[PDB]
Amino acid sequence: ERAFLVAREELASALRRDSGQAFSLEQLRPLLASSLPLAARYLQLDAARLVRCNAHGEPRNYLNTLSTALNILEKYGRNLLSPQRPRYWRGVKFNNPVFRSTVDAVQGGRDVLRLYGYTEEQPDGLSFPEGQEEPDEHQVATVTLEVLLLRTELSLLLQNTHPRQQALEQLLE
Amino acid sequence: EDMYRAADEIEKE
Ligand SMILES: [Cl-]
C-alpha cells in the first residue's frame, strides 16, 4: 500500500502531465482510505467547509448538490491545464448559466475558483490578475486532483461503499 | 457550452 504523500505526488504529477487523464478508484484509494481526518487529507481544497457549510436537507440531496458543483469545478481545472485552453478562460462571470446553476449553488464554490487563480473580484465575476500570463500549473493540478477526489468520496458515501464510511458519516449534518 | 461568459453575452451570439 502506497503512502499517502507518495500516491498524492504521483497522481498530481500525472494530471499535470495529461490534463484529460482519468483516475481509477485503485489509484485514488490511498488518498481516501487514509485514517487521517478530512481536514488533514486536503491541503488546498477546503473540503471540510464544503461538506459542513452546505448541509441543507438530507445527505441524499446536498451531497448530490455538492457533487454537481465538484463535477463542474473539475472541468474548470482541466481547462486551465489543457494544451489548448478554451476561449475566455481568464475570467468567470457569476451570471454564466453553467456556473450559476451548478457551482454557485454551493457555499465555498467561488473559493475553489480563487484557488485556481481567479483571485480578482468584480461585482460581475472573478478573473485572473492583469499581468499574470499563465495559470499556476502545479497549483491547478493539485486543486483539480483534490476536487475530483472529493467528488469520488461523495460518490462512495452515497453508495455506502466508502472504506471510511462509518467515520465520514459523522461529518454529515 | 460556454462556462466563462455571462448569459447575456452568450445570448448576443
Ligand atoms: Cl477522473
Numbering used by the authors:
A (entry chain A): 7 to 179
B (entry chain C): 53 to 65
What does the original paper state about this entry?
We determined the structure of a slightly truncated HOIP PUB domain construct (aa 5–180) bound to the OTULIN PIM peptide (aa 49–67) to 2.0 Å resolution. The two molecules in the asymmetric unit were highly similar to the apo structures (rmsd ∼1.5 Å), which was consistent with NMR analysis. Both HOIP molecules showed similarly well-defined electron density for residues 53–65 of the PIM peptide. In analogy to the p97-PNGase interaction, only PIM residues 54–58 interact with HOIP. The PIM peptide forms a 90° kink, in which Met55 and Tyr56 form a bulge and mediate key hydrophobic interactions. As expected, the OTULIN PIM peptide binds to the conserved PIM pocket in the HOIP PUB domain. The second hydrophobic PIM residue, Met55, is bound in a shallower groove between HOIP PUB domain residues Tyr82, Ile78 (αA), and Val104 (αB). More importantly, Asn102 in the PUB domain acts as the cornerstone around which the peptide is wrapped and interacts with the very same backbone of Asp54, Tyr56, and Arg57. Arg57 of the PIM peptide participates in a π-π stacking network with HOIP Tyr94, which is the only residue that undergoes a significant conformational change within the PIM pocket.
The linear ubiquitin (Ub) chain assembly complex (LUBAC) generates Met1-linked “linear” Ub chains that regulate the activation of the nuclear factor κB (NFκB) transcription factor and other processes. Here, we show that OTULIN interacts directly with the N-terminal PUB domain of HOIP via a conserved PUB-interacting motif (PIM) in OTULIN.
